[PDB]
């Protein structure tokens, strides 16, 4: 009897395993900008600067 029980357990734990295909998708979009403008001044004879 115990044999016929454990064969019915083994029968149901022996099943095939499905297999998943995991496909990640990573999207990284960067963008940048900048505008740096300015006027400087100087006189080195008598040192005076902007």
């Amino acid at each position: 009897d115990i044999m016929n029980a454990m064969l019915e357990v083994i029968g149901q734990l022996d099943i095939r395993r499905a297999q998943v295909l995991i496909e990640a998708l990573i999207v990284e979009m960067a963008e940048g900008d900048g505008i740096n403008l300015g006027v400087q001044w100087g006189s080195l004879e008598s040192g005076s600067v902007i």
């Binding site: 357990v9 149901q12 734990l13």
Partner: protein, 48 residues
């Protein structure tokens, strides 16, 4: 009176051919084997 062997798993009898009639009746009476009860069960968890 009564005997059996579980080498053979067989009722032996000592007594009447009336004991032979009724105790072939009880030879037959409890010979039956209970149907499987699914005493144990393997359950497939869906989530947990």
């Amino acid at each position: 009176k009564f005997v059996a062997d579980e080498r053979t798993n067989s009722i032996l009898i000592s007594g009447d051919p009336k004991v032979r009639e009724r105790l072939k009746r009880l030879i037959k009476q409890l010979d039956v084997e209970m149907a499987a009860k699914g005493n144990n069960r393997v359950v497939y968890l869906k989530y947990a």
